[PDB]
Amino acid sequence: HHHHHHMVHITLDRNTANSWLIISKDRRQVRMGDTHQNVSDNKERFSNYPMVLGAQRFSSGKMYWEVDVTQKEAWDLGVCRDSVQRKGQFSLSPENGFWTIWLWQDSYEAGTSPQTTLHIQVPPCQIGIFVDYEAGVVSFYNITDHGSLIYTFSECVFAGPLRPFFNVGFNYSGGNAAPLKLCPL
Ligand SMILES: CN(CC(=O)N1CCCCC1)S(C)(=O)=O
């Protein structure tokens, strides 16, 4: 792909984070803590899952960023509407305002309803995410495999401003403590 020149500097919004997350001082990394991180509750925090939003809002144009997923067993990545549900249980779907892919139990899937199997020969250590607001496209790229395409959501109906979306995943196994990291431009 040749989307690299639309690179944007994403930072994480602490106020949206689940209360167990630890976001680095530079707001570029996030990991699961082993306990509640001693913050007040608010209506923006994702309550049931270890999720956090980027601070940036996009309503036009072309945007690109990269995320490091090295040695994680589970995670979700993509974009979502600014007005997605924060509290309780929900599925990641375009009907609920999410355009995402994930790793779970040794398989990769796109967050359609129902979910779609992905075909990845080289497990990625970094993921590229491209959004074309006007075209209604969200695409995912395997940076470890020379930028190969993972998945394209087309005919997207965003229906609002978009925010970068992250889930570090649960750490029931003791094998999923590693962080998500926003990679430098
Ligand atoms: C289920 N987790 C503990 C927990 O209750 N929380 C952390 C995750 C978000 C909800 C809050 S664990 C064992 O760390 O994956």
From Swiss-Prot:
It comes from the Eukaryota. It is found in: Cytoplasm; Cytoplasmic vesicle, Autophagosome; Nucleus; Cytoplasm, P-body. Induction: Up-regulated by IFN. One of its GO terms (biological process) is protein K63-linked ubiquitination. Residues 8-185 form the B30.2/SPRY domain. One of its GO terms (cellular component) is cytoplasmic stress granule. Homotrimer. Component of a SCF(SKP2)-like complex containing CUL1, SKP1, TRIM21 and SKP2. Interacts with CALR, CUL1, FBXW11, HSPA5, IKBKB, IRF3, SKP1 and VCP. Interacts with SKP2; the interaction with SKP2 does not depend on an intact F-box domain. Interacts (via N-terminus and C-terminus) with DCP2 (via N-terminus and C-terminus). Interacts (via C-terminus) with IRF8 (via C-terminus). Interacts with ULK1, BECN1 and with ATG8 family members, including GABARAP, GABARAPL1, GABARAPL2 and MAP1LC3C/LC3C. Interacts with TRIM21 and SQSTM1/sequestosome 1. Interacts with IRF3. This is E3 ubiquitin-protein ligase TRIM21.
